[PDB]
Amino acid sequence: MKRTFQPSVLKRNRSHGFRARMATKNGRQVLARRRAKGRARLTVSK
Amino acid sequence: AAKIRRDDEVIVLTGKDKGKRGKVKNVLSSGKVIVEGINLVKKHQKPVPALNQPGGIVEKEAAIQVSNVAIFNAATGKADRVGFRFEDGKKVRFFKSNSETI
RNA sequence: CGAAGGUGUGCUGUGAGGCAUGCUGGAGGUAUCAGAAGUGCGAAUGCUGACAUAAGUAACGAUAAAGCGGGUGAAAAGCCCGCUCGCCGGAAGACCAAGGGUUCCUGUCCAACGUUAAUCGGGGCAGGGUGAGUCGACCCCUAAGGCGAGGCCGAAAGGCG
RNA sequence: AGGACCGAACCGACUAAUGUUGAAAAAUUAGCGGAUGACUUGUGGCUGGGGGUGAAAGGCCAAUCAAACCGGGAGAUAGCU
RNA sequence: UAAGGUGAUAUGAACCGUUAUAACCGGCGAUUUCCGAAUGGGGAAACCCAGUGUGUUUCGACACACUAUCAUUAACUGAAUCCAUAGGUUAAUGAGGCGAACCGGGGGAACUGAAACAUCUAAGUACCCCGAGGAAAAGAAAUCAACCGAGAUUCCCCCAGUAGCGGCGAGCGAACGGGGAGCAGCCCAGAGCCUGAAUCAGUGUGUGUGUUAGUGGAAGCGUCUGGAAAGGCGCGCGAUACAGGGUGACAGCCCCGUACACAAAAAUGCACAUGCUGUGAGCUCGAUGAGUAGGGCGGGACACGUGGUAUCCUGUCUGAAUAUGGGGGGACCAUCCUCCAAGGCUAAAUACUCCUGACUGACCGAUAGUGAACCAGUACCGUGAGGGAAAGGCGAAAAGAACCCCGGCGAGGGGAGUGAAAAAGAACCUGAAACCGUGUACGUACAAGCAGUGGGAGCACGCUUAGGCGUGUGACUGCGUACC
Numbered sequence: 001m002k003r004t005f006q007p008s009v010l011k012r013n014r015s016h017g018f019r020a021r022m023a024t025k026n027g028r029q030v031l032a033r034r035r036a037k038g039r040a041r042l043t044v045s046k
Numbered sequence: 047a048a049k050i051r052r053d054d055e056v057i058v059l060t061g062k063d064k065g066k067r068g069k070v071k072n073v074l075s076s077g078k079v080i081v082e083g084i085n086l087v088k089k090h091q092k093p094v095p096a097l098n099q100p101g102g103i104v105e106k107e108a109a110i111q112v113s114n115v116a117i118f119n120a121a122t123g124k125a126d127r128v129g130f131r132f133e134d135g136k137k138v139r140f141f142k143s144n145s146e147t148i
Numbered sequence: 149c150g151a152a153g154g155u156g157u158g159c160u161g162u163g164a165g166g167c168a169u170g171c172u173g174g175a176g177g178u179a180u181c182a183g184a185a186g187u188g189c190g191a192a193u194g195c196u197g198a199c200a201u202a203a204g205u206a207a208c209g210a211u212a213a214a215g216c217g218g219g220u221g222a223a224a225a226g227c228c229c230g231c232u233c234g235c236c237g238g239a240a241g242a243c244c245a246a247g248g249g250u251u252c253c254u255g256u257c258c259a260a261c262g263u264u265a266a267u268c269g270g271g272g273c274a275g276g277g278u279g280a281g282u283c284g285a286c287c288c289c290u291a292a293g294g295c296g297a298g299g300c301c302g303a304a305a306g307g308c309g
Numbered sequence: 310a311g312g313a314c315c316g317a318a319c320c321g322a323c324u325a326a327u328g329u330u331g332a333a334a335a336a337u338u339a340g341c342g343g344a345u346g347a348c349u350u351g352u353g354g355c356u357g358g359g360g361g362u363g364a365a366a367g368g369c370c371a372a373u374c375a376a377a378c379c380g381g382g383a384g385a386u387a388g389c390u
Numbered sequence: 391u392a393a394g395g396u397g398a399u400a401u402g403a404a405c406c407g408u409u410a411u412a413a414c415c416g417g418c419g420a421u422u423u424c425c426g427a428a429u430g431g432g433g434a435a436a437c438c439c440a441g442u443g444u445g446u447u448u449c450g451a452c453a454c455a456c457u458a459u460c461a462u463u464a465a466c467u468g469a470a471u472c473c474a475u476a477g478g479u480u481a482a483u484g485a486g487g488c489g490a491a492c493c494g495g496g497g498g499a500a501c502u503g504a505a506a507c508a509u510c511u512a513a514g515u516a517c518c519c520c521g522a523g524g525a526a527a528a529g530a531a532a533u534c535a536a537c538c539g540a541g542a543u544u545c546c547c548c549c550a551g552u553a554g555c556g557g558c559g560a561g562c563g564a565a566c567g568g569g570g571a572g573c574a575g576c577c578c579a580g581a582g583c584c585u586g587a588a589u590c591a592g593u594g595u596g597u598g599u600g601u602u603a604g605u606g607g608a609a610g611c612g613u614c615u616g617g618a619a620a621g622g623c624g625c626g627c628g629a630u631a632c633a634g635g636g637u638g639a640c641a642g643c644c645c646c647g648u649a650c651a652c653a654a655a656a657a658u659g660c661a662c663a664u665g666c667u668g669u670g671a672g673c674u675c676g677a678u679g680a681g682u683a684g685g686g687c688g689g690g691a692c693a694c695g696u697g698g699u700a701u702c703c704u705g706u707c708u709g710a711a712u713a714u715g716g717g718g719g720g721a722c723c724a725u726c727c728u729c730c731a732a733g734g735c736u737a738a739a740u741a742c743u744c745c746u747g748a749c750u751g752a753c754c755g756a757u758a759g760u761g762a763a764c765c766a767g768u769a770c771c772g773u774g775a776g777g778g779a780a781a782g783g784c785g786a787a788a789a790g791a792a793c794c795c796c797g798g799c800g801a802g803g804g805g806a807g808u809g810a811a812a813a814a815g816a817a818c819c820u821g822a823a824a825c826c827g828u829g830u831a832c833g834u835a836c837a838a839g840c841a842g843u844g845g846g847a848g849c850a851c852g853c854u855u856a857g858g859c860g861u862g863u864g865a866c867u868g869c870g871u872a873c874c
Binding site (some may be wrong): 047048049051052059060061062072073075077085086087088089090091092093100102103104106108109110111112113114115116124125127131135136137147 | 392393397409605606608611617619636637638643645786787788789790791792793808809
């Protein structure tokens with residue numbers, strides 16, 4: 001049937017994309033916490 | 047500093063054959079050397095007729111650890127501590143085992 | 149020239165234990181006496197790993213159904229070729245897009261994958277392939293909305309206009 | 310002309326049946342029905358936690374919700390287990 | 391410094407060799423695509439599109455070097471509007487982003503305790519924000535005492551579970567001051583005399599010694615066992631060197647090393663001496679801060695709760711005195727002592743880590759210790775913040791699987807080679823419990839409960855020199871409702 005998440009790299013890159021996160025205090029802090037946990041990707045749209 | 051070099055005969059202080067001596071053929075970055083007539087290894091090798099076709103086994107040379115290879119004394123059938131000192135370029139033997147200690 | 153660990157069989161004490169002797173191992177061990185606890189396992193609707201039974205029992209993804217002859221192969225009813233049949237035919241067809249990402253094609257390979265057979269394959273592994281002035285994007289303007297100077301509000305993150 | 314009678318595309322929940330360790334995170338088969346509207350829809354936005362949204366059920370708010378989800382104070386507290 | 395190197399899986403060709411760029415390293419100093427402060431503007435993780443000025447040419451499009459924002463400095467320009475200035479332009483400096491932990495300021499709980507709750511406790515914690523230095527912060531008095539006097543602050547042991555506060559509850563909890571660590575104080579309100587005299591930093595050098603590239607440094611042989619010894623033995627010898635580590639089973643005498651000892655292109659710490667620049671040793675006499683202290687009203691910080699509540703910040707109104715003046719001394723008053731505001735600054739003894747170095751653990755060892763020793767914050771879950779594994783160790787050495795063959799010119803495998811061994815074949819140390827095949831002996835096709843414990847025929851097995859001992863199996867029968 002239908003899913004609550006449908007595949008879209010346009011809206012993923014708009015909410016969770018690297019520059020989109022960096023352009024906000026809290027998203028830039030999510031990225032700072034990615035670097036604290038050591039996550040190998042900082043974007044999953046590119 | 048050097049303690050054996052490749053220009054004169056060496057003897058092996060490891061588990062290897064104690065009745066053989068030879069010169070160094072080649073040196074490795076692993077702290078190892080290849081020596082003439084001491085040791086050989088069988089080496090089967092992949093036949094692969096359209097890419098190799100080696101005619102069976104290779105029977106090749108094998109390296110040994112450089113700390114327990116020593117210079118042959120050519121006098122009493124054994125290894126000796128001799129010292130390496132020279133005024134210009136490559137340091138060669140000064141044979142401290144044939145001189146008095148101070 | 150066989151020390152610990154693990155472990156069998158016998159011996160021995162009221163008992164936690166202690167002792168002799170075989171198998172395995174090939175590296176480590178330490179007799180005694182004095183100091184010191186990170187010192188006694190089956191349970192916590194406890195945490196993590198392994199395996200039996202349930203049981204060859206369930207299922208193989210609806211209700212279009214491929215057949216025979218020949219081939220290729222060690223092997224084929226499913227692959228290649230021939231003849232023939234069947235169903236869908238507003239789809240079970242044709243073109244465009246999002247989203248995905250080497251999937252295309254020939255050339256081979258058959259361990260694993262497609263909960264099978266597999267010679268097929270979007271699978272393994274190579275090699276080849278993506279030729280634009282005009283096509284879709286870009287151009288130039290800009291809606292909803294976002295950002296936002298000078299300016300304002302706010303410790304501030306942030307926000308108004 | 311039409312908050313009009315029937316009706317494709319389009320939409321969609323009411324009855325019945327099948328499904329229910331499924332094909333299945335809600336479908337399937339048949340029918341009745343919504344179809345110029347107080348409608349529906351392609352594409353991109355905007356509305357947030359006692360706040361949103363609601364012709365208003367405390368329903369819906371990414372399966373969760375008399376108060377969502379994650380991370381912290383938190384190994385809080387339990388005359389009990 | 392040095393002869394073997396050109397990173398590794400990785401070999402070979404080619405290439406430096408060994409001789410004045412071989413590789414490797416120390417100093418400083420270039421080179422540094424695009425994203426990214428990102429600085430023309432736009433924006434999207436590595437992309438997009440302009441302008442200013444100059445030149446070139448089929449004047450079909452090339453391609454330098456430059457253009458941000460804010461604050462300040464200068465120069466030109468300039469609107470209403472003359473002059474001017476907002477505005478515009480050009481050059482320069484400062485900031486911007488990053489980096490572990492510490493640190494000043496701002497926002498500010500609930501839980502918890504009060505065996506119950508609001509004040510009080512908890513807590514200026516938790517978490518978030520701003521900002522900044524090598525430390526941040528504090529300071530030498532309108533302070534603190536008590537007639538004795540102190541004479542900066544911070545950090546430590548104490549003072550003290552005392553004073554004080556306190557639903558006179560629960561409990562919060564000092565100061566004075568001692569012992570100690572650690573000791574730098576000054577200027578402006580203003581001038582001269584003295585002479586550049588004390589002290590500190592910076593900078594050109596010098597000396598002494600470390601740091602960043604180092605190389606020297608004493609002794610062990612034989613014999614046996616073993617495939618191999620760093621072992622046994624004979625004993626021998628060194629030790630200011632018996633520390634790690636490495637090398638084929640235990641290395642004081644094999645290697646990198648240690649004790650012990652040096653050497654210097656450039657860069658640089660500590661300390662001794664010196665030049666220079668800046669600061670200026672000593673003497674003496676003036677002079678003592680008025681929109682802010684008080685005062686009414688209200689908060690904040692005080693150990694300190696609304697009380698009889700001082701003090702210091704601070705909101706608001708209001709605003710002062712001169713020596714028979716003023717602040718304070720925890721109500722208020724006097725007396726008295728002490729300070730005299732209304733100006734500015736301050737040693738590190740203290741705090742801490744990504745990093746640099748020395749030392750250490752009665753630390754763990756693949757479920758340990760971090761979730762993570764392993765191409766792990768990977769695979770994988772969610773729209774997302776955020777959750778989150780499996781998986782190490784053949785061997786001394788790659789010697790790593792030829793050759794002989796069955797098969798599909800297979801998988802899988804025997805023989806065989808290597809090797810100590812692959813009954814070590816990379817799926818590889820040695821491996822108990824769980825699991826499943828292989829073989830032998832017994833009971834074995836008419837009788838019903840925790841399957842054990844006693845008594846026990848037959849059969850089969852092992853010990854014993856055997857003299858009532860075990861093992862396997864077991865007819866039948868006395869006793870018998872488990873365990874947390």
